[PDB]
């Protein structure tokens, strides 16, 4: 019983590691789009 509980424990820990890695990979993408939008707004500014 003790060994089975321990094994389930590291299984859950590995699952948490995997989901956190996926989230960290997800969080990156937003910056570039905002960058291009800001350049477009500045271009509109200078044209006007």
């Amino acid at each position: 019983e003790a060994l089975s509980k321990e094994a389930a424990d590291e299984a859950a820990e590995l699952a948490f590691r995997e989901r956190r890695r996926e989230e960290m990979r997800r969080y990156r993408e937003q910056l570039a789009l905002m960058m291009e939008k800001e350049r477009e707004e500045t271009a509109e500014r200078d044209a006007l």
Partner: protein, 426 residues
């Protein structure tokens, strides 16, 4: 037959008691929904000590929760086994003391302590024969120390022939959460020495050390420390709830541990506490339990027993064992380390055995020791109290509310004479 109520004060007390109730409910085989689902019949005869028959297998804990911030109640109820407590026992204020002994002893006490007194009275005369009371609270906080202490005083002046257990966590420089820790601790210990019959001294630093070395835990959240303390309370009262070859209730332990009325502060330890990896290489025998028991680092307090002497000691046992092995092991541990034991008291150890071990372990043990080494922590607290009290730092928040200085003088003098007599008996 014998009855023990449970009182939890403050956030620390509420969480520790919630874990304790989870552990005892699991031990008696009752599911979080509140219905019995166990297998052994032995679990049924000794649940009136902690539960009550409501409606066809519905059991409600004999506990009273008191606090001032709804966050604690929400945390208690949100988690599992939170729907077993009766809402009527949720005596509860609204303002908040906030790490202020004066507030929690004079301002919010006068309007909330009467209500919890009525609740605990209704819960007390509901049962047949009171064995004692069990209170869990902190000593650094405001709503846990002051209100809990005043509740202790009122109950003692109400029921003087009924015993009292109070598990109190104490502050340390290594684990120091609030800034007014000595100011609260000195008054709390000054009031507890005459009111409480005995207490179990606890602290976070020793628990952190235990879960680092023995448990080898990576992220030891508060849950693990509360689990250890709940196992401690389950072990200390296991004799009432299960038969054994040598029964010993709370009164027997108290009379066998307290030689003088002011010598009622104990340090507690639990065993076995093995790491997740070394559990397979370990052996299960009485000498192993005894050796892991008397270890200095296994104690749940920041007081090395090797710096003093043991006045009286007690060990509570659970599992199918042999009494002769226990007796000879205690005789051997007394004979080997003869210097650490007091001289004018033969047989400084009281032993007891219970036939029902906790599930998941074949053999368990609980150690309660009354050594004089605890005086160093009292000196450590009193020197901080004097250092902060010399120039009246943080003082007027107490005095400006109704508190006064000569009570601080009384508390420091009481601490000084207590540590002086501890040194005397060393």
């Amino acid at each position: 037959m014998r009855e023990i109520v449970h009182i939890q004060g403050g956030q620390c007390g509420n969480q520790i008691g919630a874990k304790f109730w989870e552990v005892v409910s699991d031990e008696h085989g009752i599911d979080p929904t509140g219905t019995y689902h166990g297998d052994s019949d032995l679990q049924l005869e000794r649940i009136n000590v902690y539960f009550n028959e409501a409606t066809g297998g519905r059991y409600v804990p004999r506990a009273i929760l008191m606090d001032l911030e709804p966050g604690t109640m929400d945390s208690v109820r949100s988690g599992p086994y939170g729907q077993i407590f009766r809402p009527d026992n949720f005596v509860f204020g609204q303002t908040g003391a906030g790490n202020n002994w004066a507030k929690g002893h004079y301002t919010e006490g006068a309007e909330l302590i009467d209500s919890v007194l009525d609740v605990v009275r209704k819960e007390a005369e509901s049962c047949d024969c009171l064995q004692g009371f069990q209170v869990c609270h902190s000593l650094g906080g405001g709503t846990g120390s002051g209100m809990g202490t005043l509740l202790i005083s009122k109950i003692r002046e109400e029921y003087p022939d009924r015993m009292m257990l109070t598990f109190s966590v104490v502050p340390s420089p290594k684990v120091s959460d609030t800034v007014v820790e000595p100011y609260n601790a000195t008054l709390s210990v000054h009031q507890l020495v005459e009111n409480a019959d005995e207490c179990m001294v606890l602290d976070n630093e020793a628990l952190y050390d235990i879960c680092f070395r023995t448990l080898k835990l990576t992220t030891p959240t508060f849950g693990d420390l509360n689990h250890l303390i709940s196992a401690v309370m389950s072990g200390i009262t296991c004799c009432l709830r299960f038969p054994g070859q040598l029964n010993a209730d709370l009164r027997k332990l108290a009379v066998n541990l307290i030689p003088f009325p002011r010598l009622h502060f104990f340090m507690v330890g639990f065993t076995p506490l093995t790491s997740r990896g070394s559990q397979q290489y370990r052996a299960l025998t009485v000498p192993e339990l005894t050796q892991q028991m008397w270890d200095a680092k296994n104690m749940m307090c920041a007081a090395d027993p090797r710096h003093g002497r043991y006045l009286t000691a007690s060990a509570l046992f659970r599992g199918r064992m042999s009494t002769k092995e226990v007796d000879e092991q205690m005789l051997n541990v007394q004979n080997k380390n003869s210097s650490y034991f007091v001289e004018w008291i033969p047989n400084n150890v009281k032993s007891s055995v219970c036939d029902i071990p906790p599930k998941g372990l074949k053999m368990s043990a609980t150690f309660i020791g009354n050594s004089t080494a605890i005086q160093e922590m009292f000196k450590r607290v009193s020197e901080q109290f004097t250092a902060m009290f010399r120039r009246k730092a943080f003082l007027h928040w107490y005095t400006g509310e109704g508190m006064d200085e000569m009570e601080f003088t009384e508390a420091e003098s009481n601490m000084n004479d207590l540590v002086s007599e501890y040194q005397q008996y060393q």
